[PDB]
Write a protein that binds this ligand. Structure first.
Ligand SMILES: Cn1c(=O)oc2cc(N)ccc21
Lengths: 300, 237
């Protein structure tokens, strides 16, 4: 169990860690979060009491170093930083714990939600989507645009998701125009799985990271990317059976975890109705279909 | 964007563009079988690809053989249309290739777009107009060449005959849509109007009768009256 201390909390802010969140008052004596489960990625994220715009946050993995938070009054936000001095860091953490000024990552032992939502997400892959290689953690926010969004401006701050476009040469073999547009199996399996992602665990990991970025930051281009990756699978006649079964679990926990009041902008009517009811894979998502009908029958 | 009443004059500017109409590509008769069930039999069809500026009709004839052993024919019709239109553009010298292609039915957009991926600078547009090009098979000579064909075949016709020697493209296109609109709403009366006077003949290399200017006015007037009457009948106004 690892710790992320905070130097101070000088401004009122709602702090999130994974699917949990805590309200923190201006200059309240908050000095970090402890008992963070090791073995998964995590995200710590912020929304200032004064500006409900710009949700922002940091992906990290505690095995990659000792990380802490410090408010920067020039740039006006909570920044993640790395402490390289192991002993200076154990010292801060121990002293803060002794004074009991740290909240406890509040995991119910029966709960596999965070695992289920990050099964395939790997910190090394995140850092390739969010390129900033001086840091071992990754900053995302509400307003960052994707590479594909930029093609239709500042590349250093972009989400370098894998570009998927159903009406492109990459997706359509000459001479199989109608075939490949109606049955995307060759874009999925040959182009994307074998060619670019190499295996389905990287595909699934990008899908999961996209969803989480849409949920926690309302990042609109992440939501687009998440829908695109679902639709490519659902629109393929030929999908490995191991992938369909896992997809059904993956989507189930995403729909399960989504705030009820956000289903209107985060859920794309066309994609979901096509995947669950018209696509090749209409019958292969029983768990995702049952939870979608019992929780959001309006959208459908 | 979409083509509509407002941007209508754009058809006649000097940017090359083609209309594509797919209505007559896949044509069937419906009949009963020995056991009483219903069956379709396909007849030859065609793609109606027209430059509204010159009046050049690239009439691609769709032989029934293309359907042999295929399923979901009405969906395939749209792809076969897109394939043939794309092959026509590739066959044309660069200076002749269109800058726009305007599809009369929106279902053609994705098939054409996918077939034209090699032509990123050709814009594929829908339209809000209710153009009468389905009535093209009411033009005797076009219907005849389609019906007689024994193989796939492209046939080139000027749908304006020689009108452009005397009138503008704008006027020519409006005459053409008036004639086709009439043929669509009441073929029998429309055709009666065009051939009544046996002294007005159709040139061998033409589709319509050789009316003088004043006779076209009388004709155009008779076609208007036809269209308006049929509306009253349809709706009881
Ligand atoms: C010169 N010309 C004509 O009058 O009718 C044509 C049709 C086609 N497609 C190509 C050329 C012509």
């Amino acid at each position: 169990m690892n710790t992320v201390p905070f130097t101070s909390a000088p401004i009122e802010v709602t702090i999130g860690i994974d699917q949990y969140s805590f309200n923190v008052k201006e200059n309240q004596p908050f000095h970090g979060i402890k008992d963070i489960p090791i073995g998964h990625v995590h995200v710590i994220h912020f929304q200032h009491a004064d500006n409900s715009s710009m949700r922002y946050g940091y992906w990290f993995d505690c095995r990659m170093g000792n990380f802490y938070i410090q408010y920067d009054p020039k740039d006006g936000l909570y920044k993640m930083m790395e402490e390289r001095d192991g002993a200076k860091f154990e010292n801060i953490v121990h002293n803060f714990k002794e004074r009991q000024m740290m909240v406890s990552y509040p995991k119910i032992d029966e709960d596999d939600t965070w695992y289920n939502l990050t099964e395939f997400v790997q910190m090394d892959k995140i850092r390739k989507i969010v390129r900033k290689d001086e840091n071992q953690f990754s900053y995302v926010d509400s307003s960052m645009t994707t590479v594909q969004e930029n093609e239709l401006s500042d590349p250093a701050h972009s989400l370098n998701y894998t570009v998927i476009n159903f009406k492109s040469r990459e997706a359509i073999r000459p001479g199989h125009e109608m075939e490949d547009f109606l049955d995307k199996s060759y874009y999925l399996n040959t182009v994307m799985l074998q060619g670019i992602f190499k295996n389905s665990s990287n595909y699934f990991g990008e899908l999961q990271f996209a969803f989480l970025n849409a949920m926690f930051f309302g990042n609109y281009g992440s939501s687009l990317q998440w829908h695109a990756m679902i639709e490519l699978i659902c629109s393929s006649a030929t999908v490995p059976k191991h992938m369909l079964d896992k997809l059904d679990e993956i989507l189930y926990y995403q729909i399960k975890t989504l705030p009820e009041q956000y289903s209107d902008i985060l859920l794309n009517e066309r994609v979901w109705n096509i995947c669950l009811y018209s696509s090749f894979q209409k019958n292969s998502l029983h768990n995702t279909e049952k939870i979608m009908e019992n929780k959001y029958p309006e959208l459908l | 964007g979409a083509m509509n009443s407002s941007n209508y004059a754009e058809l006649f500017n000097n940017d090359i563009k083609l209309f594509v109409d797919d209505t007559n590509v896949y044509r069937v008769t419906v009949h009963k079988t020995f056991e009483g069930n219903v069956a379709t039999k396909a007849i030859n069809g065609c793609i109606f690809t027209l430059n509204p500026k010159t009046g050049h009709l690239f009439l691609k004839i769709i032989h029934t053989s293309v359907w042999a052993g295929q399923k979901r024919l009405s969906q395939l019709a749209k792809w076969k249309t897109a394939e043939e239109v794309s092959a026509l553009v590739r066959s044309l010298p660069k200076e002749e290739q269109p800058k726009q292609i305007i599809v009369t039915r929106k279902a053609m957009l994705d098939p054409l777009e996918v077939h034209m991926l090699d032509f990123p600078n050709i814009a594929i547009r829908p339209t809000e107009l209710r153009l009468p090009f389905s009535a093209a098979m009411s033009i005797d000579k076009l219907s005849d060449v389609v019906m007689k064909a024994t193989e796939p075949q492209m046939v080139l016709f000027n749908i304006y005959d020689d009108w452009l020697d005397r009138i503008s493209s704008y006027t020519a296109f409006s005459r053409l849509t008036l004639l086709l609109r009439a043929l669509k709403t009441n073929e029998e009366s429309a055709k009666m109007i065009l051939l009544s006077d046996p002294t007005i003949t159709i040139k061998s290399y033409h589709l319509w009768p050789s009316f003088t200017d004043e006779q076209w006015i009388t004709i155009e007037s008779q076609m208007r009256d036809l269209i308006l009457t049929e509306y009253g009948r349809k709706y009881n106004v």
